[PDB]
Amino acid sequence: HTAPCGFVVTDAVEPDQPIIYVNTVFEMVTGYRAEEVLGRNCRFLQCRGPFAKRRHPLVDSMVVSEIRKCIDEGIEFQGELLNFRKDGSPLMNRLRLTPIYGDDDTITHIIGIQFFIETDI
Amino acid sequence: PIPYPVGNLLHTAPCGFVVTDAVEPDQPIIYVNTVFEMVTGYRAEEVLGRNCRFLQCRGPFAKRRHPLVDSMVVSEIRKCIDEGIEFQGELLNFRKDGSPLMNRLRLTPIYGDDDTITHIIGIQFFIETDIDLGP
Ligand SMILES: Cc1cc2nc3c(=O)[nH]c(=O)nc-3n(C[C@H](O)[C@H](O)[C@H](O)COP(=O)(O)O)c2cc1C
Ligand SMILES: Cc1cc2nc3c(=O)[nH]c(=O)nc-3n(C[C@H](O)[C@H](O)[C@H](O)COP(=O)(O)O)c2cc1C
């Protein structure tokens, strides 16, 4: 009786798309809790757990770039990206980004939909 | 150690979420979140397996879309879905109790393997409206 995917909402107004909301699937799958992720950028998912301070090299920088262009140009994104759980275990993340236009025909929010796939060592 | 519960900030969820199955006929709902349940007044078990268009009816005992919801917007939505593209717009909906809801709806398709659409995601921002069908 559960969502098939993670949901993430960021604030497109504040600098660098802070997370204002994640759903329970996001929390259960990634091992992070809403409280520790709120206010941060989603790119911590590309670092191998919370004590890796650099993007992991197997994270496809071409896709990360496309994601950046898409957010900046206020358009849709779909792609796939290595991410990692809080415990460092890898995760394939089939990600969809979609902007929300507000009253001013301005982007207020971005929705991320995460269809997580499974593992390897 | 003692576990840490999931979902401590549901009450901070800014929008409804709906997921439909794009493969079954007529986009049946396979999931709705708790903001949807709370705002629309319809609870998950009653809406699963149906098409979202029931929200255009004034409550649960009206079979057809209310004449006040924009037939032009409804049409653009249909087009967008069937054309496998995204949609954003504003639609009159109704809570279970019959009261007007203004639904700022964004629809995005989820392509699977096969570069074929497996799901559509609906994000509902319920905004303010002056629409008021009197007492
Ligand atoms: C709503 C939203 C959800 C996102 N979800 C993810 C995610 O689940 N995994 C991920 O690796 N990046 C995700 N991102 C992307 C990063 O936050 C960031 O935009 C990306 O790493 C490119 O930016 P950068 O080059 O500054 O790192 C998301 C972005 C937004 C706006
Ligand atoms: C994922 C998804 C979510 C939807 N959410 C809503 C909604 O919240 N309110 C609404 O009035 N229609 C919603 N719809 C639209 C209707 O289900 C339907 O597509 C629309 O009325 C146009 O088609 P029709 O003229 O055949 O009814 C949603 C559609 C999809 C695919």
Residue numbers in the entry:
A (entry chain A): 13 to 133
B (entry chain B): 3 to 137
Reproduce, without paraphrasing, sentences from the article in which this PDB structure was first reported:
Towards these aims we solved 2.5 Å, 2.6 Å, and 2.1 Å crystal structures of dark-state WT ZTL, G80R and V48I:G80R (residues 29–165) respectively. Namely, G80R structures are analogous to WT in all manners. The primary difference is the formation of a π-cation interaction that stabilizes the Dα/Eα linkage and C82 that is necessary for C4a adduct formation. Increased rigidity of C82 imposed by the π-cation interaction is consistent with having an effect only on photocycle kinetics. R80 within Dα forms a π-cation interaction with F84 directly above the photoreactive C82, resulting in steric stabilization of adduct formation. The observed steric stabilization through the π-cation interaction is consistent with the longer photocycle in G80R. In ZTL, Q154 does not adopt a specific orientation as observed in all other LOV structures, rather it varies in all four molecules in the asymmetric unit of both WT-ZTL and G80R. G80R does not impact ZTL structure or allosteric regulation of Ncap or Ccap elements. In this manner, G80R acts as a photocycle variant only and allows direct testing of LOV photocycle kinetics on targeted degradation of PRR5 and TOC1 (see Equation 1). The G80R variant, likely due to the stabilizing effects of the R80-F84 π-cation interaction, enhances protein yields in E. coli substantially.
